Each structure stands twice: as structure tokens, then as C-alpha cells.
Design an enzyme around this catalytic site. Structure first.
Site, PDB file in Angstrom:
ATOM      1  N   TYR B  54       0.753  -1.262   0.041  1.00 22.79           N
ATOM      2  CA  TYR B  54      -0.017   0.110   0.046  1.00 22.79           C
ATOM      3  C   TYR B  54       0.837   1.152  -0.012  1.00 22.79           C
ATOM      4  CZ  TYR B  54      -3.556   3.429   1.562  1.00 22.79           C
ATOM      5  OH  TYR B  54      -4.365   4.499   1.584  1.00 22.79           O
ATOM      6  N   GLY B  61      -6.585   4.670  -0.321  1.00 22.41           N
ATOM      7  CA  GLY B  61      -8.238   4.204   0.042  1.00 22.41           C
ATOM      8  C   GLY B  61      -8.555   3.251  -0.900  1.00 22.41           C
TER       9      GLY B  61
HETATM   10  O1  LIG Z   1      -8.250   2.490   3.587  1.00 17.50           O
HETATM   11  C1  LIG Z   1      -7.389   3.086   3.989  1.00 17.50           C
HETATM   12  O2  LIG Z   1      -6.293   2.468   4.494  1.00 17.50           O
HETATM   13  C2  LIG Z   1      -7.125   4.430   3.417  1.00 17.50           C
HETATM   14  C3  LIG Z   1      -7.838   5.660   3.516  1.00 17.50           C
HETATM   15  C4  LIG Z   1      -7.786   6.755   2.981  1.00 17.50           C
HETATM   16  C5  LIG Z   1      -8.874   7.635   3.192  1.00 17.50           C
HETATM   17  C6  LIG Z   1      -8.749   9.114   2.571  1.00 17.50           C
HETATM   18  C7  LIG Z   1      -7.665   9.483   1.959  1.00 17.50           C
HETATM   19  O3  LIG Z   1      -7.655  10.757   1.413  1.00 17.50           O
HETATM   20  C8  LIG Z   1      -6.447   8.774   1.758  1.00 17.50           C
HETATM   21  O4  LIG Z   1      -5.463   9.033   1.553  1.00 17.50           O
HETATM   22  C9  LIG Z   1      -6.765   7.381   2.501  1.00 17.50           C
END
Ligand SMILES: O=C(O)/C=C/c1ccc(O)c(O)c1
Ligand SMILES: O=C(O)/C=C/c1ccc(O)c(O)c1
Ligand SMILES: O=C(O)/C=C/c1ccc(O)c(O)c1
Lengths: 514, 514, 513
Positions: B54, B61
């Protein structure tokens, strides 16, 4: 030049905000000037006759059983302002502080406060200048403390604020604004430190801000429909007539007007379609939109009716005499002692409006949540990004920020239910109306930011769906997006949006999309 | 010779605040430096081996399903910081913003974040400087947004704050602080934009402030007993032993210590007295004090136990790794993906502490209400005024202000219960821990103001009861009043107290009565 | 028994009369005609196979599944089935009937398509002494409670008798002389629709608040008679200076309550001319504490809130909150929208709940002052009789009132908790039913607080003015004498819990007249 508001007896909310915001100058009408001079004479007689009157021959609060000799009234009223100046916290903003001064003035203008010509002139001068007294926002249980601070400011013993919020010391304020130091030699100090001026001022500013935000809520809901092939039949006048809430009828009518001329919305009434055996099956979409679009008239309308009640009550309060004691113009009695300073009305309406603002902000927040969701936005890019997906997230951060703002709004509830017996049990019940109005203001500010995020999202969505030329978009929709684009560029690649969100929110609170 | 905190694995709350407040420098211990260098290498290997991770090979996200090629990672992480910079609202104060920076550093120091030496140095340099990044307080659902703004600041693309809160632009900050611009070329951006650093930083500052406020609450309760002939048998150790709550035992012990040497409190145990026939009747006073004195150990104790729980949880959080993804130091797997960034622990403890603060603030507010009531303060002047009564009202205004501050505190409830599904339903549950910590902070600020009012009242009450010489007053009591009098003069006649209340409040949050 | 003839409009009092069983209900000829016309329109819509929600489609997000005419019976039968997931205590007898009435008033407008038989089933229920047993929880604002109602009317759910005793479906139909609801005309959506539940709960709240408000005024008046309260604070002149309708009304009603009283202070303090010799500290201040001096303003704000609530509710009650709806003018076959979104009752219920909490707070503080020997101007501590110490009088009841108020304050507005649900189709919901129920609970607490205050005042009046109540106004005397018919003086400590509960029930249904 500059518009002028001639104050006699009644002033409406728009006029009041015009003066408070500096858009209009204020003048006391001759009839009002005369009623006040007549009241000024009554106060004088009351004092000469040594009548038993609160603040003139008695201590304050529970100390009212301590009678005071006429020779010490100057000291009595000077210490009143002194002991009450215990306020703390951030100062009320320029417009709001001025709205408080206006509220006190309107009450005095009715001719039952005994205020002297000089006192009245000092308030009028402040309102006509480009200044506002710097008064702490906390300290009152609902508004002696904030008003006592105002008095000190008008005497040059307290700071002033310019339109930008920059503070000026007392001397500099009187100088720059050409204000004469307040003189309470007439013993009319109770004409300035009385009533519900602070909460009323805060609420009148709240009322004006909500009108503009409500217009944006409608215009953005209409543009959302143009971005998601929304169905206009849910906004039909016939539906409003079946459930005749004024606010709903208005919301619906306004929504219809916004999309007039649009080729992006679905205008067909689904019940006109006759089905046959070949139609029985599963269609791509349901025949009705999700509630954030279909029930916009009902949700927006409920809020509009709440604001309407708030304004009806507020209009009465703004034009009332919330002073104590009061000197009856007819001369039936030398003075009357009661509790017209109890701001329970503004407390309850501000709490009610606060809830309505939270509900409407929640609608805007869900409208953002839907528009930016690739599974629900009917073909639009995830989070409305441009550039390669993944490498670009578009409004993904802004969407979460809207949720965060809404969540914070919900954590604060009504202020009215927290009455606590104080002042040695003399004020065994308090309104907390000033706190109520201030908590409502905070929610209004959060609502503006949420609407700002929605507006930016919609500007982008409109272009992604209809092209930069906004083909098919309604005239009103095109004008709104074009106006936004004059100051806020398209999101071609990810960039920090925080400052733009805050800048747009400030605009939404002061102007409507037209 | 500015103290130094050597960070290896664990750091306590006091050390954390010492660094955040600039009272101590921070240095990374040799073993920590090595663990980080090793983690840095692991991140390199992951990239080298094209491991599915990731933020290194995926979007963010719900967009994580979009895989990214190694040549686009620099852009990927650059836009990550960009889209997340949607924060709004007043910036976190100097100390809190730095506490946030420290929180992220401590997590990285555990050696599972892959942060490069340079990245770590930028955080250490900031903490050893007199600056703090200027980051908006709102936008996170619990802390990517505030941390993204931090990254921009450290790159010279965002403002900085000096100890006084005055803002400097990016360039000036790097210059004045002699800081190097942050370089994320090692693709370690996720080591900075991750975890619960913001809420943790806010909470650790809350913990420090509450320790001092708790000491004032105890000291003022004790002084109140010396001003009202309070009975000490209610604070006996025997009672604590019968109901062994640690917080209560501690509260009772500290209260007894404060009044040690006092000749103004009643120490006789009422049950020791044997009654005869001529005693039956109505005595001037009851054998027990009102609850604001008699139940001080139980009320203060419950608050102290709440803070204890809050601090145990926070200590674990501060020294934990709340990142995602993480790179196991044991090399078992290339990386782990989970949700350690979910700040539910800080959210729930912050809400629980906020309730406790509101309860203890209520205690103080009632102590003020009793002390200033002439019908309840056993012979003291109404509202502790000096000079002629009526002409002077003393703290009558400040007493109501205390009530108004408390009522406002009560209007806001827990933040945790308002979770809302967001981020296209990917974040279907959120902690709102940052908001919770912030709401608790506001309450702590109101509590400090209420305690400040009580402190001023008690200083006056002590001199009125025991004379300027404070005859019969305990050594601790005398020291406190004398210390206050060094900066706050007696109230011999009514004067504005707002500025003094505010000034004292600021002191109470940073120092205890010793 | 009086009869309420329903045509187009019915006021809140008429609605409660029918809901409470005090009046029979009859559908006026014009309404029967409009409904027959609507029944015909639904028939034509079905014959023409028009695309209409619930007639040719599934429900909610499942509306994209079109349904063949032969399966509509099953379709609507299952609608009722899946919706019957309600839980919690059943709505009380009056409220449940109020819900049935709300749906009927909506249908009476002639845009729902309801068949004559369906209408008759609702009318029969209301004219019987029964109410359907419907769970109070389950709706986000009112398909679930209405579905339960439907099952009850088909004899597949319990009924409640006036006392709340439950009867099974079969027994309910037999005892109430009710025919089983038959939905063969495919008019199920006429019964499972709108804001009927929150509206029914709200109209019962409205009626209860009118009575409690009358007690709040009457007790504030009697309090003045027990504490030598000053009437100048309630002068009409003050009302005119701050013209809030609710305040003027409260002040006027307060003055009327103490008319003829020799126990209140009527002198206007400003009439007194002071001399140098008078300068010093007098026994009492020239004005009363706020719980008396500011009663017009506090009660008034509460009354204006109720007035707004009632204005909005009257419109909601008499509106058509159905979806879909069939235009009487025949412009289009049917309209699809969201008039079922109960945001109006949600916001007003929440606003009224706050007002109720504020007014309960006033009553609670009035008790706190009256029972405090340091503040009640000479009355015994906690209004006890018999030897002091050995007796504590209303000391326990006074604390109980504070506990009741503190509990009320713990619950806030329901409206702010909207949560996207139904697969995100219902991404915003009103929660109006919950809001109305939360307000009802606060109203019940207010009744109990007022009951404690009334019992304290009856005792206080006798302690101040003797059992003969010398100097007490005619209204005050009548109120105390009425209370004393069922509630004996407190000559020696005794359990008051059951009396408080008993009196509270009375206050909610009757005013001091
Ligand atoms: O599910 C995740 O791990 C990521 C969540 C997430 C939600 C909104 C954002 O702007 C972002 O960079 C990451
Ligand atoms: O009962 C009143 O009419 C006065 C109340 C009041 C309570 C606190 C103050 O500081 C003050 O000046 C006045
Ligand atoms: O969008 C609508 O108009 C219908 C919504 C809905 C949502 C849940 C149910 O159980 C149901 O019968 C209907």
C-alpha cells in the site's frame, strides 16, 4: 454614496444587518428622537424625586436590598460597569459586536430607557463609523458582561476592532472613528448595560448567514441533479400542495427554478409509462433518486420553516425593550421592575436553528459522499479526480474533511437545557441565550465549509460530465460554475484544497448564487 | 543547560511534554538509530523486490485496487500529500503541533516505518528548534490531513509558528529555524502521513494540563476549607481505606497535606462528643459540611482515576506504532497491512476525560457559588466585596461568568459516538479521536478559567477572614495567596477582572501551587 | 359521545378527542366521494399497467425489479412482512390510535387510492375501544409501525384495551367488532406510508403540553401566594414592551390566577420616595428571584415554541405524506417523491423537547426555593409538619424532582443523528418518530416534577395561610381544595412516590379550572 436606515420604531432583519455590516448608515427619526428626549426627562424626574429604583438608589442583584444615597449614584454606576467586566475568550467579530450595539440602540429608541441624547449619539456614531468595540464572547448567562465591556470601549478604556479584526487601543479608536468618549453623567448607565443585546446581535448575524447558506444549499442540490441525471418530478409543485409546509413549497419552487433550462436532468414522470410483458425484468436504475435528491424539498423545507420561526421571534426581540427597570412613556408609574432581560426566546430559537443547520449540513455532507463515490455517482471518476487514477485521488481528502466537520457539529447540543442557579440563587434560572446563539454560529460556519467542499466538487463534476463547455447544463448552473471558476481553477492534478475551501466558505456566508 | 531526552523505545508523558514545550532537546539513542537504519533498508528491499505494498505499488483508499509502477511512485506520494492537505480551522497551538511531530517520531523510532535518516533528522531538527509547523486543526476523522500539512511545512511549502503563535512563511521558517527542506526521495512519505499523531499530541498536552489543574483543584478546595471553617474529618485516611479507590485515597491525602498546620479548619471528630439532655435542640450549624467540601475526595478522586486510565492508555499509544503499512523488524514478512491507525483508544479516553473535567469544573463552580453567597459563606461579605456594600459588588460578575463557562462546557458531549461512513464507504467506521481530544482541550481551558476565578475569590476571602496577615492559615495556604498577590492585587474596590482571570488561567495550565 | 366529522381539516383538539376515545369519528360525504374517486383512479392505474412504485415495482433500491400484475398480491403481502421488524415497548393506547387517525386523515384528502373497505377498517378501529399493539422502535421516520398496524388489523397481531391489557389478534377482532383488513384492491401502500406514527405521537405530546403548561402557570401563581411574590413583574405594560405572544399570554394568565389574592405584593416599588434615613440594608430586595420575576419570559418562550410546533403539526396532520400519490385532477397518473420524509415533525419535536426541559427546570427550581428554609421566607424546612428533625417533609421528594430533571437533560435532539441506510438509498433520514418519542419522555418527567411542586404548594399554602387558606385567591383556593380531595396534607412523613405518580397522570390529562 451609502444607503441610510432611518430608525423610528421598527427595523427589519435585513436593515439591521445592513447597518451592522456597515452597508448602510443609521439615523434616528425625529419622532424617535422626541420619544427619547421625553424619556430622558422622566429619568431625571425619577432621580430628583428619589424614587426607589434598581440601579439608581439600590445595589445590584441580591445586593439590591442595600439602598444608595443620591450622592453616590455616579460611583454606583461606575462600579457596575467595573464588576461586570469579567468577560473572557475571543472577542465577538466586527459585524456581530456592532449588531449588539445596534440591538441596544433599537431598544432605547422605543423611548423607555431614559438614555440621554449624548448616550444615544455615541451608539449611533459607533454604528456609522468603520469601528466595532472589542468585546469578549464569554461571561454572560443571558447580556450584562459583554455590554459592560462595550461601555468601557466607548469610554476609550477598551479596544476597538477595524473591519479586518485588527485591534486599536481605546484612544486610537475614538480618534480614528471620530467618536466622543461616552459620558454617563446623566446616570443612564442602565440604558447601556441591560437587555439581550449580545445574543440578539449574534442571532441577527446568524439569520443573515443562514439565508445565504440556504440559497447555496438549494443551488448546489440543483447542480447535483444536473451532475447525476436527477429526476425533477420529485420537485413538482403538485407534491408541495399535498403537504403544504411553506418552507417545502419554497424549497421545491426554488429547486425547479435552478434547473429550468437543463437538459441534464430527467423530467419524465415515470407513471406515464405503460408497461407490457416485455418490460417485466430488472432495470439498470430504480425509478426514483436516493433521498439526498428526492427528499431535498422536505429536508431543506423543514430547515427553512425553522429559520422562519427563528426570524419571526428574533424580529420581535430586536424591536423590543428588554430593559430593566423601564420608564413607561404614558407616565402611569415612575418605573416598572420585571424581567424582560431574560433571553429565553433567543435561547430556544437559536438551539432550534442550530439543530436545523446540523441537519442541512448533514444533507450537504451526504450529497458530497454520493457524488464522489464511483459506485454511486453513475459513471463519474472516483472522487472526481483528473489525471491517472491512483496517482491522483482528487477530492478524496476533501470528502473526508466534510465528514469530519459534520461530526464535530453533532458533538455540540442545545445550550438552553443547562440552566444553573447562580448569583447567590437570585438568578435561579438563566437563559444561556448568548451561548445558544454562539453555538449556532459555530455550526453555521461549519455548514459553510461543508457547502464550500460541495460547490468545488460540483464545479468539477459538471465539467467531467458535460465537458468544459458545460453542454446541457442550465443557465443558472452555468453561471454558478463560471463564477466559481473565476477564482477557483479546475482540479487537473491533486493539490492542497484547504485554503480554497476556507476562502470559498467565507464567500458563501456573505453572498448568494445569482 | 537545556535538558536532553534520549529516545530509544519508551518515553513517558512528562518527557514527551518537556520536548513538545521546548523545555528539553531530543536525541535519538544509538540503538534507535540502528533500528531505523535497518528499517530504512527493509523499505528499500520491498521496493527493490516489487512487493505488493500500500502506497508503494498501489493507489490510496478504495483506489488501492489500482496498481502503480515503480517509475511513478515519486508522483504517487507527492499527490498523496497534496490531496490530503484539505484542512481548515485555527491552527494547532505551538506546543500541540510539536507534540504531534514528536508522536510521529516516537512511532518511527520503533523501527517499523522505513523512514530514512534524513526524514528522521527533519523531525528531530524541528523539535530542537523554537518552531512548530502551522497545521489546521480540522479535517481528520482520526490523522492524515494534519500530518500532510506538516509535511508541506517541513518542505518549506507551509507556514511555521514561533512560541508566541506568530506565523512565518515556509522560507522564513526553514531559515530562522536553520532547518533543511524535507526530501521524500526515498519514497518514505507514508512514514510521515500515518497513525494517530495529531490526536495523541493533543491528548498528551491535555494530560499535562490536567495534572496541574488537578493540583489547583485540590489546593483551592483546601483553601476553601480554611475560609469556611471546613471539617477535616471528612478527609480522614480511614475513610479512604474503607472505599479504596486510588484516586480518592490520593485526593484525601493531598487535601490533608494542604491544610496541615492550619488553625482555621475544624479537626474535631463529632462522634467523640457525648450529648446530654440540655443539648437537644437546634444548633447553629450541622455537624457536616456541604458536599463541595465533604465529598471533595470522592469527586476529585473519580476525576483523578479517570485521568489515570486516560494516561495509561495514552502512554501505550504514544510509544506504539500506529502506521499502515508496517515493515516487521523480525523480517518474518515484507510488510503487514492492517488498521493500527484507528484512533478509537484516544477517542474513548479523551471523551471520558472530558466528562471528568466537566464534573470537576462543576465542583469548582459550586465552590465559587457557595463562597460568594452571604447566606452560605458563614459571615463573609456578599461576593467578597470590599468598600461599601451595594456601591461595590466585588466578584458578583466573576461568579456569574464562572457559571456561564461551566454551562457552555456542558453543551458539548462525547465526539466518539458520531462515527459516519465515509471515503466511499471504505472508512465505514471512524474514531473521531482528534476531534475528541480537541473537545476535551476546550473543556480543560474552561476549567482553568473557572479555577482562576475561584483562586482570585479565595485570595480575597482568606484576607477578609484572617486579615492581610493570614492568621491561622496553613503554610501551604499562605504561600499560595502570597504567590498570587505578587501579580494580582486585592480587590479593595470593583474593577474589571476579565484580563486578570485570563492571565491567571494561562498560569494554572502550566504550573501547580507549590 | 360527541362526533368529529372528518372532511378535509381536523384540528389538534378534535384529533386527540378521537384518539383518546372521547369522540366518535365519521367520514363526511365529500370525503367519502373524494376517496371513491381516488379508488377509481388507482383501479385505472392498475388496468393501464402504469409504472408505479409498489404496484409494478419492488421496494426501496429493489424498485428496479419490475413486477407483473399477477404477483402484486404477494408483492404487497411481503411488503408488510419484511417491514414488521419493530421492537421495544408498544405505543400506548392513545398514541397508537393517534397513528391510525393520522393515516386516515391523510387518506381522506383523496390522493391515496384507499378502498372503501380499507377506510372502514380504520374508522372502525377508532370508534372501538381498542388500539393496535405496535412496537415503538424500528423506524427512521413510519413503515415499520404501520406494517405492524396492518398485521393487527388483519388479526395477525395483538390489540390493546384502554388499560393497556393485551388481546390476541382473533380476540381483538371479536371484542372490537372489527372485520379483518382485506387488501385485495392492492391499496396496501395507502396504509404503509407517510409520517403517521411520529404525527400521532406528536399530537398526543401537543395535548399533554397544553395541560402541563396550564399547571406550570397555576403553580407559579400559587408559589407567588406562598412566598409573597410581587405582581408588578407580571404587569401587562411589560408584556407590551417586549410583545412576544407567548409571554403576553403567560403574564395575563398569571395575573388572572392571583386575581383576588391578598397574599401577593401588588405595590409598584418605584412609587416609594426615599429619605436619607432609609439608606442602609433592608430586610428584602425590591424584586423577586427569577423563578418568579421571570416566569412570563421563561414560560412564554416555552409557549411560543409549542405554538410553532402546533402550527407545523396541524399542517402535517392534515397533509398527504404518501408516496406514491395519485393526483385528484388527473394531470398525471401518479407522482413519485418524498413527502414521507418526516423532517418537520423531527425538528419541531426536538425544539419542543428542549422547551419542555427548560420549563421543567423552572418548576424544579421553584421546588428548590420553596422547600429551602433560607429562601422560603419563614416556612418550615422542606415544608414538614410535626417535630423538626424527626420529620423531613418533602426533603426526599425535592431531591427526586432534581433527579428527574437531571435525567431529562441527558437526552438531546434526535434529528442530528441521521445515518445513511437501506443500501445508501435512504442516505438521509429524519428520525422524527424517535424525536417525538424522546419529547414524550421529557413531557412525562415534566408531569412528575409539576406533581411534586403541586403537592409542596398545597402544603405550603396551608402552612402559610392556615387550613382555611386565608388571603388566598379564589383560583388558588379551588386548586388546593381539589388536590386535597385525593391527596391528604403531610402531617407526618410518609411515602410520596405513589401519590406523585398518581397526580402526574392527572396533570397530563386535565388543567386546573
Ligand atoms: O483504507 C485506507 O487504508 C485508506 C484510507 C484513506 C482515506 C482518504 C484519503 O484521502 C487517503 O489518502 C486514505
Ligand atoms: O436580579 C437582578 O435584577 C440583577 C441581577 C444581577 C446579577 C449579577 C450581576 O453582576 C449584576 O450586576 C446583576
Ligand atoms: O426509497 C423508497 O421510497 C423506499 C424505501 C424503503 C426502504 C426500506 C424498506 O423496508 C422499504 O419497504 C422501503
Amino acid at each position: 454614496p451609502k444607503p441610510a436606515v432611518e430608525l423610528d420604531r421598527h427595523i427589519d432583519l435585513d436593515q439591521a444587518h445592513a447597518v451592522a455590516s456597515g452597508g448602510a448608515r443609521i439615523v434616528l427619526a425625529p419622532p424617535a428622537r422626541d420619544r427619547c428626549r421625553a424619556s430622558e426627562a422622566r429619568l431625571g424626574a425619577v432621580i430628583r424625586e428619589a424614587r426607589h429604583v434598581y440601579g439608581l438608589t439600590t445595589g445590584f442583584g441580591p445586593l439590591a436590598n442595600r439602598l444608595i444615597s443620591g450622592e453616590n449614584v455616579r460611583t454606583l454606576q461606575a462600579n457596575l460597569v467595573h464588576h461586570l467586566a469579567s468577560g473572557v475568550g475571543p472577542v465577538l467579530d466586527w459585524t456581530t459586536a456592532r449588531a449588539m450595539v445596534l440591538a441596544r440602540l433599537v431598544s432605547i429608541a422605543q423611548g423607555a430607557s431614559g438614555a440621554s441624547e449624548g448616550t444615544i449619539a455615541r451608539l449611533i456614531d459607533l454604528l456609522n463609523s468603520e469601528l466595532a468595540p472589542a468585546v469578549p464572547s464569554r461571561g454572560t448567562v443571558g447580556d450584562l458582561t459583554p455590554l459592560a465591556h462595550m461601555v468601557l470601549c466607548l469610554q476609550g478604556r477598551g479596544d476597538f476592532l477595524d473591519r479586518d479584526g485588527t485591534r486599536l487601543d481605546g484612544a486610537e479608536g475614538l480618534r480614528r472613528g471620530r467618536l466622543q468618549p461616552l459620558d454617563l453623567s446623566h446616570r443612564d448607565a442602565l440604558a447601556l448595560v441591560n437587555g439581550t443585546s449580545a445574543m440578539t446581535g449574534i442571532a441577527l448575524v446568524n439569520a443573515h448567514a443562514c439565508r445565504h447558506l440556504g440559497n447555496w444549499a438549494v443551488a448546489l442540490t440543483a447542480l447535483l441533479a444536473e451532475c447525476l441525471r436527477g429526476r425533477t418530478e420529485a420537485w413538482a409543485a403538485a407534491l408541495s400542495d399535498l403537504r403544504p409546509h411553506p418552507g417545502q413549497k419554497d424549497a421545491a419552487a426554488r429547486l425547479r427554478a435552478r434547473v429550468d433550462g437543463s437538459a441534464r436532468v430527467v423530467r419524465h414522470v415515470i407513471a406515464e409509462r405503460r408497461l407490457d410483458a416485455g418490460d417485466i425484468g430488472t432495470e439498470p436504475e430504480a425509478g426514483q433518486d436516493a433521498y439526498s435528491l428526492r427528499c431535498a424539498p422536505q429536508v431543506l423545507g423543514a430547515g427553512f420553516d425553522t429559520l422562519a420561526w427563528h426570524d419571526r421571534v428574533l424580529t420581535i426581540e430586536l424591536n423590543a425593550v428588554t430593559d430593566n427597570p423601564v420608564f413607561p412613556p404614558d407616565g402611569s408609574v415612575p418605573a416598572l421592575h420585571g424581567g424582560n432581560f431574560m433571553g429565553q426566546h433567543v435561547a430556544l430559537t437559536s438551539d432550534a436553528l442550530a439543530t436545523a443547520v446540523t441537519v442541512l449540513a448533514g444533507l450537504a455532507e451526504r450529497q458530497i459522499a454520493r457524488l464522489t463515490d464511483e459506485r454511486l455517482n453513475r459513471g463519474l471518476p472516483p472522487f472526481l479526480h483528473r489525471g491517472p487514477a491512483g496517482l491522483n485521488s482528487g477530492f478524496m481528502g476533501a470528502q473526508v474533511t466534510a465528514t469530519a466537520l459534520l461530526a464535530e457539529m453533532r458533538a455540540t447540543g442545545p445550550a438552553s437545557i443547562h440552566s444553573i442557579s447562580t448569583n447567590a440563587a437570585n438568578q435561579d434560572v438563566v437563559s444561556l441565550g448568548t451561548i445558544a446563539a454562539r453555538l449556532c454560529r459555530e455550526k453555521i460556519d461549519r455548514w459553510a465549509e461543508i457547502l464550500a467542499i460541495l460547490a468545488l466538487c460540483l464545479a468539477q463534476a459538471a465539467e467531467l460530465r458535460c465537458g468544459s463547455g458545460l453542454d446541457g447544463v442550465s443557465p443558472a448552473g452555468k453561471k454558478l460554475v463560471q463564477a466559481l471558476r473565476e477564482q477557483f481553477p479546475p482540479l487537473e492534478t491533486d493539490r492542497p484544497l484547504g485554503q480554497e475551501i476556507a476562502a470559498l466558505a467565507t464567500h458563501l456566508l456573505q453572498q448568494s448564487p445569482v
